[PDB]
Structure 1
């Protein structure tokens, strides 16, 4: 079952009913001001910091879900309805919502009145704009009144929801019914004290009335769906004093048959320098100059239309670096549009706010910053370089990393600390990705401090050295890296030993020392230590590179012996040196992470897909038998049915959810890539479709969440809810899946010395063309594909056959045509 369809031409998802399985959202804003917006106009906006600068209030776990947002109550002769369906839930003759790139439109019609609203954050503005079009679709005259509505938040959302002892007495507003281009309301809570900012909520016409007090607009004992003011048919003109400020205007709208009217509403964020705060000598009236200027740039449909077209041009030009054309329009839409959009949004939003993440936490993982980079470095390489320098500057001098990074402050979280021993190597991963994409080896000479300490600067390359050496000097009894608090898997806490509720599994370590080791870090060391070695050699450090290849070699031996269970890689050794991820046990026999990543690193790979005695093939075959499902590969199997106190968070989930038997879409890509590595393209693409949004659209009633973006986790086979997704949008899944399909399935991936063209996608995509822009040139790669396991691409560059899979980088400006046959 579907609840809409894609519109590829318009680069939108078109939702054709209000009755989706869950609220489906979009993100607006591409610089500093962001909005979450559901297909029912739910959500909120904030400037930079969703915790400390939220303009508007939103309730998570509302009954029903998502029943606050930007509403427009229509009163047509005493019948009240909203085009967003919620909150009033009147029967509409028509409904559609379209989520596009940085905008959405929502349209509702009832009793001969159509209302369409376009919501977007314009480039260069800290504001959410709504262009509303009202149309009389009947054969008689209409007299309407439209009441806009938005509920303010008192800026700090944490305080807003908890400190009512103070904050029910601080709500303040100013009202401006005769504003230079219409009518406006200013929310200025705490402007009298330390805030240099306020919010403005305005419309570009004379409002017949206004309301700034929720309780007055909505009425006692009422829900938003039963708001009294709209039902009365006129604003109460209320002025807030404490309690709950809102922004609402009534606008009178008369229409002949077939007539329409346009209106432009603006919700804006405004900051004044300290010495320009006040309009008046007595300091009681906010200085609205900047607010009037913003409102003057959106006083007409014409100006609003142009901003929308500049928006569209931003995204069209943004997503013009990698594209594909094929027989598979599901593949194409994901690759060309929705996967790249999703990766940009993860850049912008980090892990801040979604309909699952509540916007109070402002950090993200160090490892997430680097990994997210892999997916967007082709779109915004200068922002990427900056990011890398930013996070490397927080790194400790011993090479250890802050586990949590705070993008807003460019600092590591001191409360959480360090100790997650996979963190340091991800910096090599990011840096190398950046350099391969851009060729900017100069980043390695950039002076970068440790723990942001002035005077401590060394070249970025040296930070790479400290990351590498950290692993070498932190190994256990079998030569595998010590795991510390956890590795990529935040729930594998082998030094925790917690029996007290409330204690954090990640940072509590009730016993010290121990010999706990991770095979994931081992694979990560083999993969990224080989990248560091390459950078070192290229840098001219011959010895450094050679010792590095030495430790890497040692680590691949360690993995194939002490890291190997017989038919798959162990997951770890625990605090007392007993194995985890062994068929010797009833539960947790096989874990996916090491299988994927170790093979990605080339460990155990033999002569080809038919070399079944190769450890890589045994492992991937074991993954197929034991972990694969119709909805993806689960994390481990069997799942644990009782608490394993020696293992931390992992067994606290019911079987089949999150880290205890969940499908993490973030780590499936590691096995998809591994499958292309050993030569089984068909299998790899199979696995990719099972977790990818365009292919899961036909089972929307099962996925539940948005059919146009990846989610973090799909319920596993041991769950009653097998197939249902949670934690949509903000996830590393986007990046890793883009890397997988663009670089390994389609096979186009930048190297230091050239573009590698190495497709492995199997028989389902017989013909396709990739257009890639790299180091200033365009590469048109046309591929004819038999899909045979083990068949690799032979290249013809500009008419002449070449050996190998590497296409040397052409001068900027040029166009290189590559033909590939396999």
Structure 2
């Protein structure tokens, strides 16, 4: 079954019923202000930081899911309905929701009134704009009253949901029925005290009335679907004191058959300078000047359209860097539109706020945001540059880092734990990807503090050496990196041994001592140690480079001497020195992570894809056979059926979910990439398809979640719910699959000195063209692809053959035509 369809020329997903398996959201904004907007207008907005400047309230795990958003009640001769369907659930004659790039449109129609709302966040604005179009589609005149409705949150979302003993007495508003462009309500809780910010909610007309108190608008004993005020047909003009502030205006309209009326609502975030906080000497009345300017910038429909068109241009421009034209429309929509758009969202959000992440505990993750860079550097490299500086500034002098930082302050914290030993190497991954993309070697000279200490600055490159050295100087008895709290796998906690319930494995104190080692970090080290060595060489650091290559060689050797189980790579050595991820144990025999990542590091790669003796092939065959499902590859097999105290969080999940046998999609691209490395493009593309939204759309009732974005977790073969996703949108799966398909499958990837063109996608895509802008020049890459196992490309460039697969960067402004034969 399906609940909608892609509309490629519009760059939209079209949702054709409110009755989806799960609320399906879009993200509005790409800069500093963000909205979670469901296909039923549910969700909330925040500025910079979902925990600390949340404008509007949303309830996770509500009954039913997603009753809470931007609503417009229509009262037409006493019948009340919402075009978003929820919360009133009155029958609609027509319903449709279109999720586009930075905007969505939701349309509902009932009994001769059609209400279309366009939602979006304009460029350069901290605001969410709604353009509502009301049309009489009947053959007789209509008169209705439209009540807009938003529920404010008291800024600090955690305090909002836990600290009523204080916060029910602090809610404050001002109401401006007769502003310069229409009516406005101001939410200004704590502006009396330390906050220099307030929210506005306004309409571009003089409203008949307003409401700012939730209880008065909705009524005692009532849900949002039964709200009293729209039922009464007029606003109660409530002025909140404490309790639950809201924004609501009423507008009565009269429309002849065929007539429409537009209305423009704005939810704005405003700041004032401290000296300019107040309109009056007594410090009682907020200074509204920037709110009046914001409302003036969206007083008309034309102004809305001009901003929407600018958003469209801005996206056409972002999507002009990498595109593909082939015989597979599903592939193409992923590569051209959806995966790139998701990559922008993960770049902005990290893992903080979705319909599963609550915008509370999670800030910007050190590993998470470093890997997000891999699928972002080609979109806006100047913002990737800034992000690298921000991440590296949260690293400590010893090369270890804060596991994550607060988006508002850019300062690291331990709220989700510390001492994760794979973290430091991700910084080198990010920087290597960025320099390959841009050629901005100068970033290595950027002075960058440790833990934000003014005066602690060292060149960025020097931070990378701290990362590299951290791993060098923390190896265990087999030459493999000490694991610490956990490696990439947050739930592989070998230094934990917790018997205390309800204390987080992520934050709980760890045992000093033991000998726990990670085969994954070892592989990570070989992969990114190699890049580090390259940057040292280019920095003129000959001895540092030689020394670095010797270490990489040691660790690579140790993976082969001590990290091999026979038919696959080992996962780890536990606190006691016993092997993890071996055929000698009944459960957790084979783990996916070191298979993909060791093979990507080139460890155990032999003659070619038919070399059944090469460890890499053996490892990937055991991944196919033991980990493969129709939905993707599960993390380990078998999943743990009992609590294993030496292994930490992992075995606390029921089998088939999350890190215990779930398909953790983020690591699937590693196996995809590995498969292209050994020359099995067909199987790599197969793996790509199994987890990719466009190919899974036709099973929307099994996947449940958004059919146009990747999810973190798809339940595994050992789950009752096998194939059902959780944790859509915010996942490194997006950036990693974009790396996989754009760079390894399709084969077009920047190197330091040229653009590598090395297709390995197999026979299902026999011809295609990639348009890639790199370093100011456009490469038109025409591929004729046999898909024959281990067949690798030859190139001709502008009519002349070249050797190997690297095309040196042509000068800015040129167009290079590459002709590729596989």
Q: Is the 8 A contact 1:497 1:509 kept in 2?
A: no
Matched, 1:275 2:275: yes
| SS at 1:727 equivalent | strand
Question: 1:47 maps to what in 2?
Answer: 47
Map 1:52-451 → 2, pairs under 5 A: 52-414=52-414, 418-451=418-451
Measure the CA separation in 1 of the matches of 2:717 and 2:353: 29
Task: Write the deviation string for residues 342-385 of structure 1: whole angstroms up to 9, x where unpaired.
Answer: 00011112222110111112423211121111110111111112
Measure the CA separation in 1 of the matches of 2:458 and 2:290: 43
Task: Write the deviation string for residues 171-226 of structure 1: whole angstroms up to 9, x where unpaired.
Answer: 21111111222111111122222222211111111211111111111111111101
| SS at 1:254 equivalent | strand
- The offset of 1:319, in angstroms, is 1.6
Measure the CA separation in 2 of the matches of 1:224 and 1:393: 45
Question: 1:630 maps to what in 2?
Answer: 630
Farther off after superposition, 415-424 or 139-148: 415-424
Measure the CA separation in 2 of the matches of 1:794 and 1:268: 55
Q: Is the 8 A contact 1:754 1:806 kept in 2?
A: yes
Q: Is the 8 A contact 2:218 2:229 kept in 1?
A: yes
Matched, 1:546 2:550: no
Question: 1:657 maps to what in 2?
Answer: 657
Measure the CA separation in 2 of the matches of 1:576 and 1:58: 46
Measure the CA separation in 2 of the matches of 1:50 and 1:621: 43
Matched, 1:26 2:26: yes
Q: Is the 8 A contact 2:415 2:507 kept in 1?
A: no
| SS at 1:18 equivalent | coil
Task: Write the deviation string for residues 230-271 of structure 1: whole angstroms up to 9, x where unpaired.
Answer: 111111111111111111111011011111111111111111
Question: 1:600 maps to what in 2?
Answer: 600
Measure the CA separation in 1 of the matches of 2:646 and 2:414: 26
Check 1:454–1:283 CA distance in 2 against 1; reply closer, same or farther (3 A cut): closer
Measure the CA separation in 1 of the matches of 2:171 and 2:265: 22
- The offset of 1:452, in angstroms, is 2.8
- The offset of 1:278, in angstroms, is 1.7
Question: Which runs of 5 or more structure 1 residues have no equivalent in the other structure?
Answer: none
Farther off after superposition, 5-14 or 353-362: 353-362
Q: Is the 8 A contact 2:2 2:697 kept in 1?
A: yes
Measure the CA separation in 2 of the matches of 1:385 and 1:271: 27
Farther off after superposition, 488-497 or 308-317: 308-317
| SS at 1:355 equivalent | coil
Measure the CA separation in 2 of the matches of 1:399 and 1:167: 41
Check 1:721–1:415 CA distance in 2 against 1; reply closer, same or farther (3 A cut): closer
Measure the CA separation in 1 of the matches of 2:581 and 2:613: 20
| SS at 1:699 equivalent | helix
- The offset of 1:416, in angstroms, is 5.6
Task: Write the deviation string for residues 76-110 of structure 1: whole angstroms up to 9, x where unpaired.
Answer: 11111100000000000000000000000000000
| SS at 1:336 equivalent | helix
Measure the CA separation in 2 of the matches of 1:569 and 1:733: 22
Measure the CA separation in 1 of the matches of 2:716 and 2:415: 33
Matched, 1:499 2:523: no
Matched, 1:523 2:523: yes
| SS at 1:251 equivalent | strand
Farther off after superposition, 346-355 or 249-258: 346-355
Measure the CA separation in 2 of the matches of 1:507 and 1:85: 42
Question: 1:682 maps to what in 2?
Answer: 682
- The offset of 1:425, in angstroms, is 0.9
Q: Is the 8 A contact 2:105 2:119 kept in 1?
A: yes
Question: 1:613 maps to what in 2?
Answer: 613
Check 1:416–1:175 CA distance in 2 against 1; reply closer, same or farther (3 A cut): closer
- The offset of 1:386, in angstroms, is 1.5
Map 1:777-792 → 2, pairs under 5 A: 777-792=777-792
Task: Write the deviation string for residues 639-663 of structure 1: whole angstroms up to 9, x where unpaired.
Answer: 0000000000000000000000000
Q: Is the 8 A contact 1:35 1:45 kept in 2?
A: yes
- The offset of 1:417, in angstroms, is 6.1
Measure the CA separation in 2 of the matches of 1:393 and 1:176: 44
Cα RMSD after superposing both structures = 1.1
Q: Is the 8 A contact 1:485 1:507 kept in 2?
A: no
Check 1:702–1:414 CA distance in 2 against 1; reply closer, same or farther (3 A cut): closer
| SS at 1:333 equivalent | helix
Q: Is the 8 A contact 1:50 1:362 kept in 2?
A: no
Question: 1:769 maps to what in 2?
Answer: 769
User: What TM-score does the superposition give when structure 1 sets the normalisation length?
Assistant: 0.99
Task: Write the deviation string for residues 43-70 of structure 1: whole angstroms up to 9, x where unpaired.
Answer: 1111112112111111100000000101
Q: Is the 8 A contact 2:370 2:429 kept in 1?
A: yes
- The offset of 1:440, in angstroms, is 1.1
Q: Is the 8 A contact 2:417 2:506 kept in 1?
A: no
Measure the CA separation in 2 of the matches of 1:486 and 1:304: 48
Check 1:163–1:506 CA distance in 2 against 1; reply closer, same or farther (3 A cut): closer
Measure the CA separation in 1 of the matches of 2:18 and 2:629: 31
Task: Write the deviation string for residues 689-714 of structure 1: whole angstroms up to 9, x where unpaired.
Answer: 00000010000000010001000000
Question: 1:4 maps to what in 2?
Answer: 4
Map 1:728-807 → 2, pairs under 5 A: 728-807=728-807
Measure the CA separation in 1 of the matches of 2:152 and 2:617: 57
Measure the CA separation in 2 of the matches of 1:584 and 1:185: 67
Measure the CA separation in 1 of the matches of 2:362 and 2:684: 35
Question: 2:37 maps to what in 1?
Answer: 37
Measure the CA separation in 2 of the matches of 1:519 and 1:525: 10
Measure the CA separation in 2 of the matches of 1:296 and 1:538: 53
Task: Write the deviation string for residues 582-633 of structure 1: whole angstroms up to 9, x where unpaired.
Answer: 0011100000000000000000000100001000000000000000100000
- The offset of 1:557, in angstroms, is 1.5
| SS at 1:648 equivalent | coil
Measure the CA separation in 1 of the matches of 2:503 and 2:346: 29
| SS at 2:375 equivalent | helix
Q: Is the 8 A contact 1:400 1:418 kept in 2?
A: no
Measure the CA separation in 1 of the matches of 2:81 and 2:784: 55
Measure the CA separation in 1 of the matches of 2:417 and 2:361: 16
- The offset of 1:510, in angstroms, is 4.9
Q: Is the 8 A contact 2:485 2:510 kept in 1?
A: no
| SS at 1:612 equivalent | coil
| SS at 2:816 equivalent | strand
Measure the CA separation in 2 of the matches of 1:525 and 1:562: 15
Check 1:369–1:762 CA distance in 2 against 1; reply closer, same or farther (3 A cut): same
- The offset of 1:550, in angstroms, is 1.4
Q: Is the 8 A contact 2:49 2:407 kept in 1?
A: no
Check 1:451–1:156 CA distance in 2 against 1; reply closer, same or farther (3 A cut): closer
Task: Write the deviation string for residues 659-701 of structure 1: whole angstroms up to 9, x where unpaired.
Answer: 0000011000000000000000000000000000001000000
| Equivalences, count | 822
| SS at 1:667 equivalent | helix
Matched, 1:578 2:605: no
Measure the CA separation in 2 of the matches of 1:231 and 1:513: 67
Question: Which runs of 5 or more structure 2 residues have no equivalent in the other structure?
Answer: none
